[PDB]
């Protein structure tokens, strides 16, 4: 649960470049032999993605900002990658989405999970039947308030170590739209020494997850190794295999999706990357002929908003009204018409010079930005017990017999000691 | 589920002799890395089992250097360089790792000594026991070696096997002998219905069992 | 020094449940595996399962699958075992082990616990003296005995002269028969001791707090 | 729902947000209890002058008028032809016809056209196909794929 790894060491977030990764089907609509333009959360091409790896003295399980979406890519031999943890706090304080492949099936659950320092899954003591099936469940300590659960088809996961180059490539897309989560998957074999292969790929939906929970951070789970021969302290003395995974960020960019005869995407264009890409996007074609074309219009954005209103002087004497030598009786309350002047309400409402202040129908802050038609002030003095009678739909010696406020009264009430 | 068989059931060894205990497994417990998964446990009298060897090739911390195991495949053997008097107990084999753990049949150890015949003594039930309504003919067999011994009850020349219980003592700390007693449970009517009662001690050292008898009317 | 403590023994009726505790001392319960074992006089040792307090996963012997559940308490550093739907066959001595370092190279055992599953109720022992039989049997040395029968539960200790006489004294372990225990004792003394000198056997039953003194 | 929700002089189980620091976003549920600060004086997370508790209780009573009586409100939101059909109205379906001009209603999509076996291969997750014009081109049968 909370036991820290012995050999884990922190490393700076190194970055690497992605050629064309981040391309996925925006929806389930089918299109073939056409070039479609769409704008959605995409990973810009030739962008920078975090460079992380897992070895026996650097173990990478960092926390990264989910933002509006992220992209995943990793090269594997034994498929060290286990899953991910998603949530705003990744603790029981709120709900967290988790995806775990525990050697039998993909499990997706929405509950209140207890956060762990180094959550992960592993196996131990394989011996003479390779197995590699989930042994311990350190992902979370407990769960409660479960609102969603999903199970995929059973399958056998091969975690056996292999030599040579990286034979597997797994890429996933994590995104959030109005709380509706979309997950995309893609898997191909590769022959890679380091970094990522040079090519193109198209990711496809894996599951639909209409959950609706805010996620601002996430973690990457890794699978470690254990044996009868060289174990360690629980669970600090456990080690994991060699693997590398990369994490990107999705932005609302527009791509030109080139669909083949079978509907599979064979090429993509990121408009913002290259002025040639902008030319293609404007022409809505994947080929640009020699010449000069108009793509868009450049403009200079304002530095800041500047407001220069006229002088608010010539204010009517509200201060004199509230500080006048004498006031009229409650039954003889004076009705005074205020017009042909400006009102500065900042000094009145926000000075905290009055015992009580309330408004009916409109908040005091909004009134400062509104222009009225007629304004009236009724000044009177009443006893403390009678102050509560000054409100819409009231009764009593003052509300009924002296001064009554209509139920639709949109004004404010001011009183002080 | 794995099955183990152990042989021999028991074996004697003097102070300084070598003891050999072997275990068998129905499945291979060795893996690619070449090491073996097994543990050896010893349960001394009045004490719980304690680990002796782990992995068959490495001695457990605090264990005497005389204990060491060896073998390959599913057939192993435990080697004790010089057996001491403290080694009395039952040896066990254990399969670890990640699998339903299985235990062995057990192997008892003892110290060899000059053979001695049992001392047969038979006592009749007490008068108080007869007053209570019960009866128990008790026969004592003490100071005999090896532990292999048997007793047959005869009532008026007729053998009776029912109601017979036997208990074997742990190896003595001074003479290294063994003691056993046979109790014949009988009701008051059954006891008083017969007079002659006999207890014959069958032992390897003597072809003719040692026989002691008494008469109810004489007691 | 690592050591495990368990309750001395328990007595329960068929169909009920028994809870056992194996305390941890000298080591942290969180980071070390846990084990349980069953010992019978005829079948020797029999395995129960293993539990990791950190993880909580448990595997049980196909014999007892579904018959028991294993739990552990991290704060109390004590491991708990529970058995349900008990029967006569469950009578045996239980042992607990752990402290593995995620390795087989280290494990420890407690003194164990004896659990008896029967519907009988505590019965004080009946102690009777065993005098020599017919005078036709004679020897240079005389033998005496003490009879204990119809008693349970164990343990029941029998000695001679309050343990002051350790010469020729043999203690015979009890035998279970029809939910009853029976043990006997014997002492060999020369002809100059008995009947010239008194010989007595003391029997103690801590469960029933019964102490008896019978002269031969 | 005056006969059910109204309880004596009020019902605390129904509450509303009277104040907020800005304008709400559609389909946004804010349960924060942060005190709304009307003035320049920090509220320090407690009520006071120019500091009001946004969460408030209704004035539901059995004797309230038509405008003041509680009215349970239910809003239905949905997406049309934007994903595989998980729901459908109680409309009886009929047998499929091919090589004929018919009026088809498949997964809520209504139109007229000729239905024929398609040589195009769609991906397992894809359901609706579109032509160059972006109009309806092909569709999977919801019952027998
Ligand atoms: C994997 O996770 C599922 C999630 O419910 C769980 O039920 C299962 O026991 C776990 N292990 C295996 C081997 O499936």
Short mmCIF file of N, CA and C in Angstrom, two decimals, chain A residues 132-200:
data_model
loop_
_atom_site.label_atom_id
_atom_site.label_comp_id
_atom_site.label_asym_id
_atom_site.label_seq_id
_atom_site.Cartn_x
_atom_site.Cartn_y
_atom_site.Cartn_z
N UNK A 132 2.07 -15.88 -14.37
CA UNK A 132 2.05 -14.41 -14.37
C UNK A 132 0.62 -13.88 -14.24
N UNK A 133 -0.08 -14.33 -13.20
CA UNK A 133 -1.43 -13.88 -12.90
C UNK A 133 -1.43 -13.03 -11.63
N UNK A 134 -2.29 -12.02 -11.62
CA UNK A 134 -2.31 -11.04 -10.54
C UNK A 134 -2.27 -11.72 -9.18
N UNK A 135 -1.27 -11.34 -8.37
CA UNK A 135 -1.09 -11.90 -7.03
C UNK A 135 -1.58 -10.92 -5.97
N UNK A 136 -1.06 -9.70 -5.95
CA UNK A 136 -1.44 -8.71 -4.95
C UNK A 136 -2.21 -7.56 -5.59
N UNK A 137 -3.09 -6.95 -4.81
CA UNK A 137 -3.90 -5.82 -5.25
C UNK A 137 -3.55 -4.61 -4.39
N UNK A 138 -2.51 -3.88 -4.80
CA UNK A 138 -2.08 -2.67 -4.12
C UNK A 138 -2.71 -1.41 -4.71
N UNK A 139 -3.53 -1.55 -5.75
CA UNK A 139 -4.05 -0.38 -6.45
C UNK A 139 -4.75 0.56 -5.48
N UNK A 140 -5.61 0.00 -4.62
CA UNK A 140 -6.26 0.78 -3.58
C UNK A 140 -6.58 -0.13 -2.41
N UNK A 141 -6.76 0.49 -1.24
CA UNK A 141 -7.02 -0.28 -0.03
C UNK A 141 -8.49 -0.65 0.11
N UNK A 142 -9.40 0.27 -0.22
CA UNK A 142 -10.82 0.02 -0.07
C UNK A 142 -11.59 0.88 -1.07
N UNK A 143 -12.84 0.49 -1.30
CA UNK A 143 -13.72 1.21 -2.22
C UNK A 143 -15.11 1.31 -1.61
N UNK A 144 -15.83 2.35 -2.01
CA UNK A 144 -17.20 2.57 -1.55
C UNK A 144 -17.87 3.54 -2.51
N UNK A 145 -19.20 3.56 -2.46
CA UNK A 145 -20.00 4.44 -3.31
C UNK A 145 -19.67 4.23 -4.78
N UNK A 146 -19.92 3.01 -5.25
CA UNK A 146 -19.63 2.63 -6.63
C UNK A 146 -20.82 2.97 -7.52
N UNK A 147 -20.57 3.73 -8.58
CA UNK A 147 -21.61 4.15 -9.51
C UNK A 147 -21.47 3.52 -10.89
N UNK A 148 -20.36 2.86 -11.18
CA UNK A 148 -20.15 2.27 -12.50
C UNK A 148 -19.18 1.10 -12.38
N UNK A 149 -19.38 0.09 -13.23
CA UNK A 149 -18.51 -1.06 -13.29
C UNK A 149 -18.62 -1.69 -14.67
N UNK A 150 -17.48 -2.09 -15.23
CA UNK A 150 -17.45 -2.68 -16.56
C UNK A 150 -16.42 -3.81 -16.58
N UNK A 151 -16.69 -4.81 -17.41
CA UNK A 151 -15.82 -5.98 -17.55
C UNK A 151 -15.68 -6.30 -19.03
N UNK A 152 -14.45 -6.59 -19.45
CA UNK A 152 -14.17 -6.94 -20.84
C UNK A 152 -14.08 -8.46 -20.97
N UNK A 153 -13.83 -8.94 -22.18
CA UNK A 153 -13.76 -10.38 -22.41
C UNK A 153 -12.52 -10.97 -21.73
N UNK A 154 -12.66 -12.14 -21.11
CA UNK A 154 -11.48 -12.80 -20.53
C UNK A 154 -10.40 -13.03 -21.57
N UNK A 155 -9.14 -12.86 -21.16
CA UNK A 155 -8.01 -13.16 -22.02
C UNK A 155 -6.80 -13.43 -21.14
N UNK A 156 -5.82 -14.12 -21.72
CA UNK A 156 -4.57 -14.46 -21.03
C UNK A 156 -3.52 -13.43 -21.42
N UNK A 157 -2.87 -12.84 -20.42
CA UNK A 157 -1.86 -11.81 -20.65
C UNK A 157 -0.48 -12.42 -20.49
N UNK A 158 0.39 -12.19 -21.47
CA UNK A 158 1.73 -12.75 -21.48
C UNK A 158 2.70 -11.71 -20.94
N UNK A 159 3.13 -11.89 -19.69
CA UNK A 159 4.11 -11.01 -19.05
C UNK A 159 5.51 -11.61 -19.04
N UNK A 160 5.72 -12.74 -19.72
CA UNK A 160 7.03 -13.36 -19.73
C UNK A 160 8.06 -12.44 -20.38
N UNK A 161 9.25 -12.39 -19.78
CA UNK A 161 10.30 -11.56 -20.33
C UNK A 161 10.80 -12.10 -21.66
N UNK A 162 11.24 -11.18 -22.52
CA UNK A 162 11.77 -11.53 -23.83
C UNK A 162 12.99 -10.67 -24.13
N UNK A 163 13.88 -11.20 -24.96
CA UNK A 163 15.09 -10.52 -25.36
C UNK A 163 14.89 -9.83 -26.71
N UNK A 164 15.93 -9.16 -27.18
CA UNK A 164 15.88 -8.48 -28.46
C UNK A 164 15.23 -7.11 -28.38
N UNK A 165 14.77 -6.61 -29.52
CA UNK A 165 14.16 -5.29 -29.59
C UNK A 165 12.73 -5.33 -29.07
N UNK A 166 12.11 -4.16 -28.98
CA UNK A 166 10.73 -4.05 -28.50
C UNK A 166 9.78 -4.54 -29.59
N UNK A 167 9.04 -5.60 -29.29
CA UNK A 167 8.18 -6.25 -30.27
C UNK A 167 6.74 -5.76 -30.24
N UNK A 168 6.37 -4.88 -29.31
CA UNK A 168 4.99 -4.47 -29.14
C UNK A 168 4.90 -2.96 -29.03
N UNK A 169 3.77 -2.42 -29.49
CA UNK A 169 3.50 -0.98 -29.42
C UNK A 169 2.05 -0.79 -29.04
N UNK A 170 1.81 -0.12 -27.90
CA UNK A 170 0.47 0.16 -27.41
C UNK A 170 0.30 1.66 -27.27
N UNK A 171 -0.80 2.18 -27.81
CA UNK A 171 -1.11 3.60 -27.74
C UNK A 171 -2.57 3.78 -27.36
N UNK A 172 -2.83 4.70 -26.44
CA UNK A 172 -4.18 4.98 -25.96
C UNK A 172 -4.41 6.48 -25.89
N UNK A 173 -5.68 6.87 -26.00
CA UNK A 173 -6.09 8.27 -25.95
C UNK A 173 -7.09 8.43 -24.82
N UNK A 174 -6.83 9.38 -23.92
CA UNK A 174 -7.72 9.70 -22.81
C UNK A 174 -8.21 11.12 -22.99
N UNK A 175 -9.53 11.30 -22.98
CA UNK A 175 -10.13 12.61 -23.23
C UNK A 175 -11.42 12.73 -22.43
N UNK A 176 -11.86 13.97 -22.24
CA UNK A 176 -13.07 14.28 -21.49
C UNK A 176 -13.89 15.29 -22.27
N UNK A 177 -15.15 14.96 -22.53
CA UNK A 177 -16.09 15.87 -23.19
C UNK A 177 -17.36 15.90 -22.35
N UNK A 178 -17.68 17.08 -21.81
CA UNK A 178 -18.89 17.29 -21.01
C UNK A 178 -19.07 16.17 -19.99
N UNK A 179 -17.96 15.64 -19.48
CA UNK A 179 -17.99 14.55 -18.54
C UNK A 179 -18.08 13.17 -19.15
N UNK A 180 -18.27 13.07 -20.46
CA UNK A 180 -18.35 11.78 -21.14
C UNK A 180 -16.96 11.38 -21.60
N UNK A 181 -16.48 10.24 -21.10
CA UNK A 181 -15.12 9.79 -21.37
C UNK A 181 -15.09 8.90 -22.60
N UNK A 182 -14.08 9.10 -23.44
CA UNK A 182 -13.87 8.29 -24.63
C UNK A 182 -12.47 7.69 -24.58
N UNK A 183 -12.38 6.39 -24.82
CA UNK A 183 -11.12 5.65 -24.78
C UNK A 183 -10.88 5.01 -26.14
N UNK A 184 -9.66 5.17 -26.65
CA UNK A 184 -9.27 4.63 -27.94
C UNK A 184 -8.05 3.74 -27.77
N UNK A 185 -7.95 2.71 -28.60
CA UNK A 185 -6.90 1.71 -28.47
C UNK A 185 -6.35 1.34 -29.84
N UNK A 186 -5.09 0.90 -29.85
CA UNK A 186 -4.41 0.45 -31.06
C UNK A 186 -3.20 -0.38 -30.66
N UNK A 187 -2.93 -1.43 -31.43
CA UNK A 187 -1.86 -2.37 -31.10
C UNK A 187 -1.24 -2.89 -32.38
N UNK A 188 0.08 -2.76 -32.50
CA UNK A 188 0.82 -3.26 -33.65
C UNK A 188 2.18 -3.77 -33.19
N UNK A 189 2.75 -4.74 -33.90
CA UNK A 189 4.14 -5.12 -33.63
C UNK A 189 5.12 -4.14 -34.27
N UNK A 190 6.28 -4.00 -33.63
CA UNK A 190 7.32 -3.09 -34.11
C UNK A 190 8.68 -3.71 -33.82
N UNK A 191 9.71 -3.16 -34.46
CA UNK A 191 11.10 -3.51 -34.21
C UNK A 191 11.85 -2.22 -33.90
N UNK A 192 12.01 -1.93 -32.61
CA UNK A 192 12.51 -0.63 -32.16
C UNK A 192 13.65 -0.81 -31.18
N UNK A 193 14.65 0.08 -31.29
CA UNK A 193 15.77 0.06 -30.35
C UNK A 193 15.53 1.05 -29.22
N UNK A 194 15.11 2.27 -29.55
CA UNK A 194 14.85 3.29 -28.55
C UNK A 194 13.91 4.33 -29.13
N UNK A 195 13.27 5.08 -28.23
CA UNK A 195 12.36 6.18 -28.59
C UNK A 195 11.11 5.57 -29.21
N UNK A 196 10.63 6.05 -30.35
CA UNK A 196 9.40 5.58 -30.97
C UNK A 196 9.65 5.33 -32.45
N UNK A 197 8.88 4.45 -33.06
CA UNK A 197 9.04 4.20 -34.50
C UNK A 197 8.51 5.36 -35.34
N UNK A 198 9.01 5.42 -36.57
CA UNK A 198 8.59 6.44 -37.53
C UNK A 198 7.51 5.84 -38.43
N UNK A 199 6.29 6.32 -38.28
CA UNK A 199 5.19 5.81 -39.07
C UNK A 199 3.90 6.51 -38.71
N UNK A 200 2.79 5.90 -39.11
CA UNK A 200 1.46 6.43 -38.85
C UNK A 200 0.58 5.35 -38.25
#
